[PDB]
Design a protein around this nucleic acid. Structure first.
Lengths: 144, 64, 192
RNA sequence: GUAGCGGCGAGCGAAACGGGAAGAGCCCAAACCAACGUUGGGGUUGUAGGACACUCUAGUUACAAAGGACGACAUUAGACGAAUCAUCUGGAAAGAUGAAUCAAAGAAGGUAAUAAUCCUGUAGUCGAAAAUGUUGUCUCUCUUGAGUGGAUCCUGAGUACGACGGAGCACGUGAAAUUCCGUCGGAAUCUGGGAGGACCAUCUCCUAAGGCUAAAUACUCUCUAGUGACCGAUAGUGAACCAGUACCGUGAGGGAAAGGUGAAAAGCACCCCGGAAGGGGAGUGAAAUAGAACCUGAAACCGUGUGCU
RNA sequence: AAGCAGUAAAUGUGGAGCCGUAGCGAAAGCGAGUCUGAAUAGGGCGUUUAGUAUUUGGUCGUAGACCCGAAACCAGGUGAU
RNA sequence: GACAAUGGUAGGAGAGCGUUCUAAGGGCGUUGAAGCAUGAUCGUAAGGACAUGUGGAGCGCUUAGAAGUGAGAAUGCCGGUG
């Protein structure tokens, strides 16, 4: 009822207010300490560092490059294919529909992690050595 | 607004599966006549960022 | 006479989700429209009042500082919005909880069609008193009934709503619920 | 916060794709024909168009060419508009206690205290001499349409582009394309020219060096009707009050303080002390320690009289 | 998410987009395994393979960022009573 | 019921008092609200009642929500008075 309301147990907590007397425990200096750079309004040094010793991310070398023609493949392992009725046909337009592939980056690839225990025909862009052997090991077909 | 990545730090580390960062070694640019064979062969291997350094630079690489 | 599946009107209410829904709705119909003036927005106070040192006085820089009488305010109100959101699946679990709680305490009244041809407050007042209804009642139909909404709206404690206008706040504030069979079927079919 | 830029330091930072709001496209220069350079006609492009030669007829006044008569609304004054009586306390009833009534009207404000039924109102209807705005129906005003042939002709020049010096593109001269300025040089003509991030070859897309164009977008000095878990006189605009005012400065310019009797002035007739101010009575009023220096009236500070020392 | 409908609401609708279900390598690439390497020979990082959306509290970053206080710098004006 | 622990600055953790506004419910008030003054009252603390004077119209309680939420000191600002 509107006159008897109760939030769930442990779901709320009161905020802490500083500079409100000595009995609270955060009264005078409000938890900052005594007379430093970190005790002034406006804060102190940058999150990485500033001044002083040479930073760690400046005494190490750079490495590598980025390829603009990069290709990433949506992978489906052999376990995710058991949801289909045995003897069915699997196509990239149906994996996205049934709820195995959410985003089709640059095609579908099948990886051999698990057990198949089916006789279904699957057609995808790429196959691995285990995926193609295990699929053909119990009856089936595949295409590219 | 949005936080900004450290561009000079994103060119030097990579993210691993457990969440750590993989780095490269220093003291390998030149002056190799002054270093022994054992030193130069063992500076080819990679390392990981220490936990002492992680406590300071973790926020600079949050989108990476 | 009328069968309704226990998915609605027959579940155990969830109190945490109901509290969250009540607080969300009540916070989302509140406008900010409040503002103060800081140092820069208060009129005047450009020059220094007196020289930094030489006379015995506290050093001051402007006559509109926070500690002056008539100066700017620091850390005051500023206009903003208070609304937020929750997952769609929790917005529906809260509504069924309200309907089920209302059903639990015998606050549900299924009736036939409201047969009104012209607006008339006394006829609906007599109808409400015949069915033994409490002071606060919510009446629900399927579409917009003009002749039902025109009357029954000047009576303090009665509100009219449709099937796709049901609220967590309307159900919780009302003391008993009066519905029609078509409205009940629409409520059962839409929700779940 | 990706690609990238960066004493590769601090830091800077995109676009195309996709999802939406809104959504019409057109006029000139040249070839060519007729008249006395002139003004008319013809003509507007990449699936290649146009000139010449072959059979040939939707008003868009926001671009697209530009002057006017022609009924419905909106705004600017307003008018109708339901329902209550009695007792108690009180100075006064709307409060308390009983009997009623209205409601497409229980928003709000006032009335001697706290009113759906006392008053102005509200819901709902009615209404325009005259002026202005927005729209629609004839009148009114312009109007040339598509394919086949391509002998031959036309399709924007000190322009494009290059070197030197700068700038702008997220891009600091870097391997810098794409585009702008100053100086100096300086093309091609459909088997033509440009682009696809130096550059060349092949492919794909487009056609520079003339012009015009509503809508979705930004803001509020204002007018009308409203809203708030915004302020309540050291707050809220500097300014609730004759405020950009008193005042200060040669000048530009800087800038305050100040709200409250009572329901109704019914704002103390008259007598006494005094030169007067001020007071003591008597009256008004529910109340005058509510008498205009007026609601409530705290602390500092200043006085008079008293129990114990 | 933007948008649309709704009382400046609640929540309908909207699946562009985002995080996770698989890593390793500078990259081509391979894939429960990959990189280095003549050689799983040894070694490095992975094979845990439960996340995801909203929100109370703590801390951080970008904004003046807990409050008051300079000596100064730049830009446009006013002054030879 | 038996035993054990409880000095404390910087600083970490936990539980509470009070103030203004909103929602729902339930109440008080001219037979006298808030405010002010006095009192020999209650709780471990922040603090809460009651009675009597003044005052002349508004205000508490319970559960939730949100903050311009607590003053002894800055040669602090404004007013009054030594």
């Amino acid at each position: 009822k509107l006159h008897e309301l109760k939030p769930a147990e442990g779901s709320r907590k009161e905020r802490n207010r500083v500079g409100r007397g000595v009995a609270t425990g955060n009264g005078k200096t409000s938890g900052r300490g005594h007379k430093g750079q970190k005790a002034r309004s406006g804060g102190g040094v940058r999150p990485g560092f500033e001044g002083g010793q040479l930073p760690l991310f400046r005494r190490l070398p750079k490495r590598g490059f980025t390829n603009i023609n990069r290709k990433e493949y949506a992978i489906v392992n052999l376990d995710q294919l058991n949801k289909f009725e045995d003897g069915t046909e699997v196509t990239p337009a149906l994996l996205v529909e049934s709820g195995v592939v959410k985003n089709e980056k640059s095609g579908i690839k099948i990886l051999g992690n698990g057990s198949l225990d089916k006789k279904l025909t699957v057609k995808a862009h790429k196959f691995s050595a285990s995926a193609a052997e295990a699929i053909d090991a119990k009856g089936g077909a595949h295409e590219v | 607004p949005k936080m900004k990545t450290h561009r000079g730090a994103a060119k030097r580390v990579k993210r691993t599966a457990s969440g750590q960062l993989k780095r490269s070694r220093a003291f390998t640019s030149h002056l190799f006549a002054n270093k022994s064979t054992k030193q130069k062969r063992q500076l080819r291997k990679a390392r990981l960022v220490s936990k002492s350094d992680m406590k300071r630079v973790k926020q600079l690489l949050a989108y990476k | 006479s009328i069968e309704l599946s226990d998915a609605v009107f027959g579940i155990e209410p969830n109190n945490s989700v109901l509290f969250e829904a009540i607080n969300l709705q009540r916070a989302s119909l509140r406008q900010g429209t409040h503002a103060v003036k800081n140092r820069s927005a208060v009129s005047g106070g450009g020059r220094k009042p007196w020289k930094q040192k030489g006379t015995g006085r506290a050093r001051q820089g402007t006559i509109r500082a926070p500690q002056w009488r008539g100066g700017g305010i620091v850390f005051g109100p500023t206009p903003r919005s208070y609304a937020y959101k929750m997952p769609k699946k929790m917005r529906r679990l809260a509504l069924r909880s309200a309907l089920s709680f209302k059903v639990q305490e015998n606050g549900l009244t299924v009736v036939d069609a409201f047969n009104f041809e012209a607006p008339k407050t006394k006829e609906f007042k007599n109808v409400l008193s015949t069915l033994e209804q409490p002071k606060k009642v919510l009446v629900v139909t399927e579409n917009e009934d003009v002749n039902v909404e025109l009357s029954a709206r000047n009576i303090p404690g009665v509100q009219v709503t449709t099937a796709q206008g049901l609220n967590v706040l309307d159900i919780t504030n009302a003391d008993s619920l009066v519905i029609t069979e078509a409205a009940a079927k629409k409520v059962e079919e839409v929700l779940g």
